[PDB]
Symmetry: C2
Subunit: 54 residues, 2 copies
Amino acid sequence: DEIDKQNQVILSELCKQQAQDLIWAIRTLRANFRDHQLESSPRYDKIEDLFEPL
Amino acid sequence: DEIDKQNQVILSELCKQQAQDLIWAIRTLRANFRDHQLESSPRYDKIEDLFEPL
């Protein structure tokens, strides 16, 4: 109801989300992605190849 | 004042410290200590050699 007033409300919820330190984030990703691995069961059947280009 | 009753009070404060997941802790230490380094300024003199055996 009153759809046009929802652009502002959805905007107000998108603007609340927290900041991310990009230097901690990339140094953490780089360090923890160097070795650590997902295990070769059937649950993880194709997942490890989404994370190989990254 | 009333010193002997302080054994229990100091004991009650030591027993409140939080638990530490040892698998997250060691995998984090190992990963983030593989490359990352301290500066070679004058403040950080002789510090980096405390962290070489570790």
